[PDB]
């Protein structure tokens, strides 16, 4: 027990139970700042005005 991701290569030399919890491959990245649209000024109106 502990933590063993399931996958093919493993899954034929031993067996496996039913899984606990979702998981998989993902990504982490530091957090930037101020993602304000470069079109902020044109934002608050349609054209019809």
């Amino acid at each position: 027990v502990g933590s063993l991701t399931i996958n093919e290569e493993r899954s034929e030399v031993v067996d496996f139970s039913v899984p606990f919890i979702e998981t998989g491959i993902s990504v982490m990245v530091s957090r930037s700042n101020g993602t304000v649209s470069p079109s902020a000024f044109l934002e608050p109106f349609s054209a019809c005005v």
Binding site: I6, D15, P19, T23
Partner: protein, 91 residues
């Protein structure tokens, strides 16, 4: 955005007539919501929130770039107009 998606698990050497028992057991557990409490007791933390907003500032950025572009548009259109006076220098 988990994408290569699977689960954790529990290893068992081949073909122990147990395997079935472990299986039915853990499922039984999922029944009674205990994998709520365990989850909420260890795998949680502060900062759990969807979105927020921070006081950005000091914008020498692509926005004002677009604005200045709308500006220079003026010089463009102006020069376009300019020559038109030459046209009536002939009429």
């Amino acid at each position: 955005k988990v994408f290569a998606s699977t689960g954790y698990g529990i290893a068992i050497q081949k073909d122990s007539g147990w395997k079935r028992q472990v299986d039915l057991a853990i499922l039984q557990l999922f029944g009674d919501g205990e994998m709520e409490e365990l989850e909420a007791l260890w795998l949680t933390g502060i900062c759990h929130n969807e979105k927020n907003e921070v006081m950005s500032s000091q914008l020498d950025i692509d926005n004002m770039a677009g604005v200045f572009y709308m500006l220079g548009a003026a010089m463009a259109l102006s020069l376009i107009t300019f020559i038109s006076e030459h046209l009536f220098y002939w009429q």
